[PDB]
Amino acid sequence: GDERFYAEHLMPTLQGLLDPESAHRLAVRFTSLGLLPRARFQDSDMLEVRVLGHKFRNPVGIAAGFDKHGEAVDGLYKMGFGFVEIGSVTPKPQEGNPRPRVFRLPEDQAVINRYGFNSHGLSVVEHRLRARQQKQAKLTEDGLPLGVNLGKNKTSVDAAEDYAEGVRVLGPLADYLVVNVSSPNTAGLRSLQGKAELRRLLTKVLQERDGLRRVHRPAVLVKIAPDLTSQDKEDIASVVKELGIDGLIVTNTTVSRPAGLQGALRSETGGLSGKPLRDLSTQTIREMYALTQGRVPIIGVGGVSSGQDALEKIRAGASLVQLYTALTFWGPPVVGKVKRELEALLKEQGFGGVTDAIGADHRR
Ligand SMILES: Cc1cc2nc3c(=O)[nH]c(=O)nc-3n(C[C@H](O)[C@H](O)[C@H](O)COP(=O)(O)O)c2cc1C
């Protein structure tokens, strides 16, 4: 469980042998088998957060896209994440884009991916989650909630019906659902972020959700891009408040390529994640928090690899944070590292707990 060993030796050597997709698949295998150090870090009460109708024993989650098909959920809690998001899941199975479709930018601590929603489909994931449904109910009660991220098939004619199907099938198995309208890798998907289409889409989603039995009724969150115009952001905030959307996930990967990227593969098509996304994401959180008057829970994600990164997002308005790319460079010890550093920084800055820090920047 040594950060230095994983960061300086183990992870780099494994990356030396395996292309990123092979490495991802192997990581999922290892994780599902529990082949990792069980956490040194025991979660402090300071790290607990209550939001989305749930207790989270720590605010650090695993972002969607690592466990796309719900295969490694328990290994992910063992890794120390306070909550787990699986997906994106599409209604029907689909292969996603041709390989290669994932690229490392080691010099930038960044990744570019164009998976294209490769997915086992709703039915397979439903059965997988059903097999451990009662274990999840206890985990959730214990402060370890589960989120399910919903996508749409490449060849679907009715985007809203794809999401509605997802709500009906995986909604009853989830503590929260994510409407992913921000994947850069599915044609036309991000235009679902525009006002009229979003309102129509989310109205249908919320109706389907409200039609589920009470104990099986998840919160609904919208995951947005970091590449939105100011107009897009205003409109989303407006729709979210008009419809009573439960929360936002901020943000997905960027189609931008910030100046300064050094990686040889920087011009590959796809969404960029990791360090170059970090502050762009933090700023989007800051803006969405203000537009929603601090009343809509935000899960902050984008380039988090340290306690400081996490705290900056929390102070900007995030109630919870996720990471993914940092894990691909630092390995499993990064989770305890982030939690440990976050706790220390909360103390240094005079916060009683994570909850006190949420949106602190806006009250300065
Ligand atoms: C390889 C890869 C696959 C991803 N797949 C999904 C996905 O299926 N659905 C989704 O909402 N986000 C997906 N993401 C985005 C992450 O959830 C997250 O929003 C983004 O990577 C920023 O966080 P990070 O910098 O910590 O990696 C993916 C990211 C990566 C790198």
Ligand SMILES: COc1cccc(-c2csc(N/N=C/c3ccccc3C(=O)O)n2)c1
């Ligand atoms: C070292 O032993 C373990 C044990 C459990 C998980 C892991 C683990 C978690 S993530 C990971 N590597 N991930 C690599 C990866 C994932 C998605 C996309 C790209 C990459 C990559 O660039 O290698 N490995 C490693």
Ligand SMILES: O=C(O)c1cc(=O)[nH]c(=O)[nH]1
């Ligand atoms: O499947 C994808 O390629 C994918 C989806 C998503 O939401 N974000 C991302 O970076 N890639």
